[PDB]
Design a protein around this ligand. Structure first.
Ligand SMILES: Cc1c(O)cccc1-c1nc2nc(N)nc(OCC3CCCCC3)c2[nH]1
Ligand SMILES: [Mg+2]
Ligand SMILES: [Mg+2]
Lengths: 265, 262
């Protein structure tokens, strides 16, 4: 079942994520192991959503689900292996910095991935650098779809406890009845700024501190050029209705000269 | 506003139109089921309506459950004594997919009052997932309706509730409604609701959006109208009961139109 996979190392995390290799093909994969609660609650809803949504989402900037291996007691999700996450990359680059062309490339690919999600009626709802994965050839991909959800048009009220605090849009913090695709754009905006400074933009300690940080910054990123700042300002618009969509962001002048450099890995 | 999601609504509509075709149950699967019938399915679906009301579940959840059941029975022979098990598991799965606060498994065992163990429910959950290959994000009548509702100017609550009522009655009767796609049932329901309440017809704007006209919709519309006219006598009555509630504007109490005019 799993007999063709050789575990190589633990990659961290519920459930447990391992790097493994397929003994017959040579392929390196990431295996996510999910305990089934066979006498109590069954398959977790987060797994049901992650799998079902990832099966629909086929795109170069969305992590590829390769297989689902069932047992009576465990589910293993077999994913393509990517070599590290954006948070680790930023930390490694804390002193050196990240070249602009790579920042631009990564942002452009994140937006392509995200626009694909939104065009397929999927909200990610947990965009943060730990959840964005990079390879040695210059790609970046959206990962960890455990908090994702398939939405309807128009949206209904969905789960409030979404998005890690630092990346959480004001409409969520303020408990608005409805939130939509704008919440993911807010997160990407935060991430854009964080690629540039290698520091979280709004590292709040509490919901109130989070809100105060947002207000005092946007009204109640030095190295960025004019086009960059224009795009960033539109990603961080307070009004969700006015916040730029991923689709429209891909046409921003910031991206006119985008390339795909390799990371300084 | 962004809630109705102007940069993506056309892409989404297109995508759902593709996926309803791929998630479509097999028409007349019941003819290949030696132990169960359309009548038994109607019983089951009517009971799921009651469940959704007891637990205050979304209508979308109900619709999903039905889709899961119909696709499951399209490939798996099921004995009558187990049909409710399949249904219970489908409703659990739909709830886990769609609800912010799904009922716990124990509530689902409790509602089958004695019949099945918890173990059986959980094992069936897993089997349903395997048979559907975790392909649970199915388009429903409701997903199309809510988009169609944005073309009203202005919105009319009785129209919306009536369209939802009609779409939900369609869930009950595999014959004829399995022949029709969710987008088509939804269009017929919206037109029939709009006509019943306001005198108006399938708007041109939705002709443009969907490619459907009253001519295209005729066969479904004819079936839905008969279903609507015969609803007070149908053996299954939970949807009617449900839609007497002020939450749904009492729409099940309205008199259906005598004729459609085409
Ligand atoms: C990050 C990392 C290293 O630092 C060193 C070696 C491998 C990885 C790493 N490669 C990964 N490849 C994939 N497909 N998924 C992962 O986690 C999915 C998670 C998304 C992030 C949250 C948990 C599940 C990975 N993590
Ligand atoms: Mg039969
Ligand atoms: Mg049908």
């Amino acid at each position: 079942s799993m007999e063709n996979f050789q575990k190589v190392e633990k990659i961290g995390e519920y459930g447990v994520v391992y790097k493994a290799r397929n003994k017959l093909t040579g392929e390196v994969v990431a295996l996510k192991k999910i305990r089934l609660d066979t006498e109590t609650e069954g398959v977790p809803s987060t797994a049901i959503r992650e799998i079902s949504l990832l099966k629909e989402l086929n795109h170069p900037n969305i992590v590829k689900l390769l297989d689902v291996i069932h047992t009576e007691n465990k589910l293993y999700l077999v994913f393509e292996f990517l070599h590290q996450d954006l948070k680790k990359f930023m930390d490694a680059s804390a002193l050196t910095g990240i070249p602009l062309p790579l920042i631009k490339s990564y942002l452009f690919q994140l937006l392509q991935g995200l626009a694909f999600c939104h065009s397929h009626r999927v909200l990610h709802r947990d965009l943060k650098p730990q959840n964005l994965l990079i390879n040695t050839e210059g790609a970046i991909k959206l990962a960890d779809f455990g908090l994702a959800r398939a939405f309807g048009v128009p949206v209904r009220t969905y789960t409030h406890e979404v998005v890690t605090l630092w990346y959480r849009a004001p409409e969520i913090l303020l408990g608005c009845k409805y939130y939509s695709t704008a919440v993911d754009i807010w997160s990407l905006g935060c991430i854009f700024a964080e690629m540039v400074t290698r520091r979280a933009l709004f590292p709040g300690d509490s919901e109130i501190d989070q809100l105060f940080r947002i207000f005092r910054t946007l009204g109640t990123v030095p190295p960025l050029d004019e086009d960059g700042r224009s795009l960033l300002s539109q990603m961080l618009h307070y009004d969700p209705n006015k916040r730029i969509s991923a689709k429209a962001a891909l046409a921003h002048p910031f991206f006119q000269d985008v390339t795909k450099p390799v990371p300084h890995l | 506003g962004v809630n109705e999601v102007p940069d993506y609504h056309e892409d989404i509509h297109t995508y759902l139109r593709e996926m309803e075709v791929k998630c479509k149950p097999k028409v007349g699967y019941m003819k290949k089921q030696p132990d169960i019938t359309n009548s038994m399915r109607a019983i089951l679906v009517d009971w799921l309506v009651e469940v959704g009301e007891e637990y205050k579940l979304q209508n979308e959840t109900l619709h999903l459950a039905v889709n899961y059941i119909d696709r499951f029975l399209s490939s798996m022979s099921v004995l009558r004594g187990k049909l409710q098990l399949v249904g219970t598991a489908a409703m659990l799965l739909a709830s886990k997919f769609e609800e912010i606060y799904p009922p716990e498994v124990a509530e689902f065992v409790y509602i089958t009052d004695d019949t099945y163990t918890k173990k059986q429910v959980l094992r069936m959950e897993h089997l349903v997932l395997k048979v559907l290959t975790f392909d649970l994000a199915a388009p429903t009548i409701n997903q199309f309706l809510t988009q169609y509702f944005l073309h009203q100017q202005p919105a009319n609550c009785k129209v919306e509730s009536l369209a939802m009522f009609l779409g939900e009655l369609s869930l009950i009767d595999a014959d004829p409604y399995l022949k029709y796609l969710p987008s088509v049932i939804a269009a017929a329901a919206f037109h029939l609701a709009l006509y019943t309440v306001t005198g108006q017809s399938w708007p041109e704007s939705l002709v443009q959006k969907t490619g459907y006209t009253l001519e295209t919709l005729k066969p479904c519309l004819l079936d839905l109208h008969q279903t609507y006219l015969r609803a007070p006598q149908h053996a299954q009555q939970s949807i009617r009961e449900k839609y007497k509630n002020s939450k749904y504007h009492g729409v099940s109490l309205l008199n259906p139109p005598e004729t459609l005019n085409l």
